[PDB]
Design a protein around this ligand. Structure first.
Ligand code: ANP
Lengths: 245, 234, 62, 63, 144, 125, 47, 62, 63
């Protein structure tokens, strides 16, 4: 049919580079793009690394910058592999690191550092060592005040009981999350709950609250209970079709 | 036979395209007619006959000057001329039909023109324009199947068909266009001196036996042309 | 290319545009081959905004 | 009986169009296919003529 | 493993930059892009200054690609304005200005880049593959 | 002589064209006027404006620069065909024949690797 | 520069340009062609 | 609108004055549209996607 | 190959060749190949050619 697909695109480029004429093709890509910067390199397929190596490995006057975090390699289901990332990590001599966290309050950074320092080799891979990170000076003032009382950066809601089933766990946690989000919204509508950078503040709108879920049925279980309280919500990963309504 | 030739929009366009690229100063070529019938897809049986028919068109005489289409050189002819005529004030059917009926009997025979007000431009394609003896003419091809017999292509029947398909207004507008173009181009132009009339050529009506059958000749009144020009101008 | 023609005789017939609108201001800036934007290199130039041209609030040309 | 008459045609042509042919042999194919499969009408005649014209132009350049 | 300074990072051969979350991995892309456009760093710099069309950036998602393209555009604009004014309020731009030898030529190159930003080569992996196949269907052996 | 008219707006140019047409008349009435345009909309606008000014616009040829240049080739020099032998459409079918005959050459080695796996001459075409 | 020359038809409105051209049509046509050096000199003076 | 050269075209390697490309053609069309506007110029573009409430951007010309 | 011969024929032609139109207008075209400009310059001797060029800037803005 003369058609083509994503996996077919990658496989065809790889085959071309591996073939006899691919050498010429390599120059065609190398002269075109002297420097290439790959981001989110932890999610990498063996094909992609073979291509990048074939093109930019040892030729002069051509740089290559790999930027990635192995602790975030979560696309294994999609064909990505962490082992090829570690292979690349072994094949590269130079390594560079960023020390400070610029994203979140110093509370969240300390919370994460404490939770991942419990055991040794937490990620159970010898090539993935965990180290504590330090927050930046800009965020030292960040706080979240709820009903006049500063809330802890991280709060774990423990369910009650000895043995809890999967369905009971899902229903109870969905209900609890719905109730807590409703309380946050009610307290922010009156100007009490504020996200504060030093003296500046702003109420907690229904937009800044995000619920991270793993599966579709999980998201629907969240959304149903959240709409039971007449709270507007939307699921960004919704792939349903309009015609099914 | 030409009368029994297939008719329609595409047959008519093919018949016109034949003359569009036909050289009048040379005899018809059989291979060319065969190729055109191959393009149109018609039967090759027409190829011997149609060629002859084409010559019957080229050699047929015209208005009393006696002009043959073969006598027209490439310098004295203009085929498929496109014209643009502006109409400034709105053109009312009643305010025009009255004048056309006043100066033309064909309009007087027919019911009044009916169309909505129009202001803007007017487009049109004149089939042929040619000059003979320093006198210009207008030639319009028509392939409408008036009748099955040659009597349906006589003077009275041709005038009846003109009145039925309202070709009167058509040739009147064509004459206004030609008049304005000649006045624009020809230095020291005069209507009566330089204009020669209008010639409707019915292809199927063309017969070597009868000179009158197939051709129709009519000259619009100069007063009608002047009043129509003034009406369309303001 | 047009300037490089040897046997060419050219006359210029332009029409000046009066800057009565924002759109006419832009067209006049283009026609007169002059630059109106202020970069603000000087601190005195950067402080005051009078160097720019007044824009009428009701104006809706662009 | 009508449907079975269509498929029969659909059979014949699907055997005729398989083999490769020189350009001059491709000339009558379009016309035969049009007149066999289609019964023209006032509106469709324009499209059919355009089809024949483009096909003839392609094969004419080729020849 | 060494601590990373965007201005001192050498751009030659293969280089791996690994860090934890929210540490500014993506944010460093813009600084490296500006360094490449202006050819700054001396010994650590590229041998020659480059153009927008010769820098390849590969991201994971389309939305991230659009975000990064817009942010690079904004950074080029702000750095050009700073070069024209010779002063700035950001520490990164301040260090860059300290590193730049001639500011007028730098502003000219930044202007050209800003005008060519429509042709910025910021793709995903699949888009990069498709584009390299189409631009080189002759060598790859594909259809046109 | 070749006279170039510069104007920031088109209406001035069109009115200059009008005045030049009216000033110097064509001797032969059947000689068509020559106006080069690369778009049909431009020709449509020129016609609608010229008709509005003069009273009617007709016998105005609107050829493309390439077609006009070839027409001038035909008229100035003898023994020149009506249509050029080398055109975009015919060079296609000529190269389609020529390419298989030249694959054995060394210079076309790359092309060979391109044309090795074609089945119905898709790559060739 | 060049205002006295009949060639220049630059004006404030379309009608003024058309009239300035119409009055000096014959004078423009009769004038001999400008030399390339003269054209370059005029364009340099205008800049 | 972007239409890249074939890649084995020799013109785009060493270009000269007068060589035409789609990019320059569109960039000049945008200037023609501005210059030809006599009274009002209206420009529109999609800012946010209706489906995802994402953020789109305007052309470099705008 | 025809360009140079066409230019040289009119360059050395003592009188105007027959069949050429009186005058030509070039309106609405802001881009032409240099070869077409050379041909029109060589052809301008015999017949007059009026180029209507919409120029957005008053002054000389090319190079
Ligand atoms: N040098 C810096 N100065 C100021 N803010 C910074 C700096 N580096 C990063 N940030 C900010 O830090 C936040 C997150 O940085 P980011 O570039 O996304 O790191 P990241 O590695 O991409 N996080 P992630 O994508 O989850 O791995 C943004 O708000 C940036 O503006």
């Amino acid at each position: 049919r003369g058609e083509l697909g994503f996996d077919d695109m990658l496989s065809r480029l790889d085959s071309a580079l591996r073939s006899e004429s691919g050498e010429v093709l390599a120059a065609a890509i190398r002269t075109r793009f002297p420097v290439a910067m790959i981001d989110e390199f932890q999610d990498t397929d063996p094909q992609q690394y073979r291509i990048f190596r074939r093109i930019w490995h040892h030729q002069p006057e051509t740089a290559l910058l790999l930027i990635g975090d192995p602790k975030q390699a979560i696309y294994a289901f999609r064909g990505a592999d962490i082992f090829t990332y570690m292979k690349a990590r072994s094949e590269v001599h130079a390594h560079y690191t960023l020390d400070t966290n610029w994203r979140s309050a110093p509370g969240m950074v300390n919370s994460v550092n404490k939770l991942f320092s419990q055991t040794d080799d937490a990620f159970m891979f010898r090539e993935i060592p965990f180290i504590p990170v330090k927050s930046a000076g800009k965020n030292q003032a960040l706080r979240f005040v709820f009903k006049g009382e500063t809330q802890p950066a991280m709060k774990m809601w423990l369910m009650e009981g000895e043995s809890c089933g999967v369905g009971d766990y899902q229903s109870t946690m969905a209900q609890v999350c719905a109730a807590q989000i409703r309380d946050w919204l009610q307290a922010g509508q009156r100007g009490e709950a504020l996200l504060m950078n030093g003296d500046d503040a702003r109420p907690v709108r229904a937009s800044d609250i995000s619920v991270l879920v793993r599966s579709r049925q999980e998201a629907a279980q969240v959304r149903d209970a959240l709409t039971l309280l007449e709270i507007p919500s939307v699921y960004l990963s919704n792939r349903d079709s309009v015609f099914e309504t | 036979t030409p009368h029994q030739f297939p008719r329609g929009a595409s047959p008519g366009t093919f018949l016109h395209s034949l003359f569009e690229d036909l050289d009048f100063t040379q005899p018809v070529d059989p291979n060319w007619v065969r190729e055109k019938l191959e393009l149109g897809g018609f039967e090759s049986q027409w190829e011997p006959v149609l060629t002859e028919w084409i010559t019957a068109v080229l050699q047929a005489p015209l208005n009393e000057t006696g002009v043959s289409l073969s006598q027209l050189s490439a310098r004295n002819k203009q085929v498929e001329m496109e014209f643009y005529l502006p109409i400034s004030e709105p053109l009312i059917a009643s305010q025009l039909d009255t004048l056309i009926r006043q100066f033309d009997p064909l309009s007087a025979g027919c019911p009044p023109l009916e169309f909505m007000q129009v202001r803007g431009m007017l487009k049109g394609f004149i089939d042929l324009v040619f000059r003979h003896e320093g006198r210009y003419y207008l030639l319009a091809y028509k392939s409408n199947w008036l009748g099955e017999d040659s009597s349906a292509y006589t003077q009275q029947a041709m005038a009846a068909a003109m009145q039925a398909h309202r070709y009167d207004l058509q040739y009147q507008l064509y004459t206004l266009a030609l008049h304005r173009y000649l006045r624009h181009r020809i230095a020291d132009y005069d209507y009566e001196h330089h204009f020669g009339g209008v010639i409707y050529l019915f292809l199927r009506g063309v017969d070597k036996e009868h000179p009158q059958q197939g051709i129709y000749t009519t000259r619009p009144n100069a007063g009608l042309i002047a009043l129509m020009d003034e009406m369309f101008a303001g | 290319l047009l300037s490089d023609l040897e046997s060419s005789q050219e006359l210029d017939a332009f029409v000046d545009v009066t800057p009565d609108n924002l759109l006419h201001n832009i067209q006049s800036d283009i026609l007169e081959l002059e630059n109106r934007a202020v970069a603000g290199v000087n601190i005195e130039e950067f402080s005051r905004s009078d160097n720019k041209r007044p824009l009428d609030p009701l104006d809706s040309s662009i | 009986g009508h449907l079975a008459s269509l498929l029969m045609q659909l059979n014949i042509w699907r055997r005729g169009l398989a083999q490769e042919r020189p350009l001059e042999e491709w000339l009558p194919v379009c016309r035969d296919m049009l007149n066999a499969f289609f019964l023209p009408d006032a509106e469709t005649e324009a499209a059919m003529t355009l089809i024949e014209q483009q096909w003839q132009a392609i094969i004419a350049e080729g020849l | 493993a060494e601590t990373l300074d965007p201005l001192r990072l050498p751009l030659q051969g293969e280089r791996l930059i690994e860090a934890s979350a929210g540490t500014g991995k993506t944010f460093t892309i813009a600084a490296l892009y500006l360094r490449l456009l202006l050819g700054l760093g001396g010994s650590a710099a590229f041998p020659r200054p480059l153009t927008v069309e010769e820098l390849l950036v590969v991201t994971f998602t389309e939305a991230a690609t659009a975000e990064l393209r817009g942010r690079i555009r904004s950074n080029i604009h702000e750095l050009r304005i700073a070069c024209l004014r010779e002063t700035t309020d950001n520490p990164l731009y301040e260090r860059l200005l300290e590193e730049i030898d001639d500011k007028a030529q730098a502003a000219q190159w930044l202007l050209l880049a800003e005008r060519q930003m429509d042709e910025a080569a910021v793709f995903t992996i699949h888009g990069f593959c498709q584009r390299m196949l189409n631009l080189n269907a002759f060598e790859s052996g594909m259809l046109f | 002589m070749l006279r170039v008219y510069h104007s920031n707006r088109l209406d001035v140019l069109e009115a200059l064209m009008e005045f030049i047409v009216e000033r110097e008349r064509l001797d032969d009435p059947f000689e068509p006027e020559m106006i080069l345009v690369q778009s049909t909309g431009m020709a449509q606008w020129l016609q609608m404006t010229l008709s509005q000014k003069f009273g009617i616009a007709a016998n105005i040829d609107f050829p493309l620069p390439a077609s006009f240049i070839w027409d001038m080739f035909v008229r100035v020099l003898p023994e020149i065909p009506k249509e050029s032998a080398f055109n975009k459409q015919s060079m296609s079918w000529k190269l389609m024949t020529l390419l298989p005959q030249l694959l054995e050459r060394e210079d076309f080695t790359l092309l060979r690797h391109y044309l090795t796996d074609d089945s119905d001459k898709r790559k060739l075409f | 520069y060049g205002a006295d020359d009949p060639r220049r038809c630059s004006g404030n409105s379309v009608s003024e340009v058309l009239d300035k051209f119409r009055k000096n049509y014959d004078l423009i046509m009769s004038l001999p062609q400008e030399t390339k050096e003269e054209k370059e000199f005029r364009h340099c003076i205008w800049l | 609108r972007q239409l890249a050269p074939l890649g084995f075209d020799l013109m785009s390697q060493k270009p000269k004055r007068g060589d035409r490309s789609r990019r320059d053609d569109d960039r000049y069309l945008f200037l023609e549209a501005l210059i030809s506007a006599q009274q009002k110029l209206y420009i529109s573009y999609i800012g946010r996607s209706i489906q995802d409430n994402s953020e789109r951007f305007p052309s470099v010309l705008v | 190959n025809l360009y140079q011969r066409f230019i040289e024929t009119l360059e050395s032609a003592t009188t105007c060749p027959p069949g050429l139109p009186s005058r030509v207008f070039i309106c609405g075209i802001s881009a032409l190949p240099p070869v077409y400009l050379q041909a029109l310059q060589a052809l301008g001797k015999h017949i007059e050619i009026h180029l209507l060029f919409t120029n957005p800037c008053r002054y000389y803005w090319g190079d």
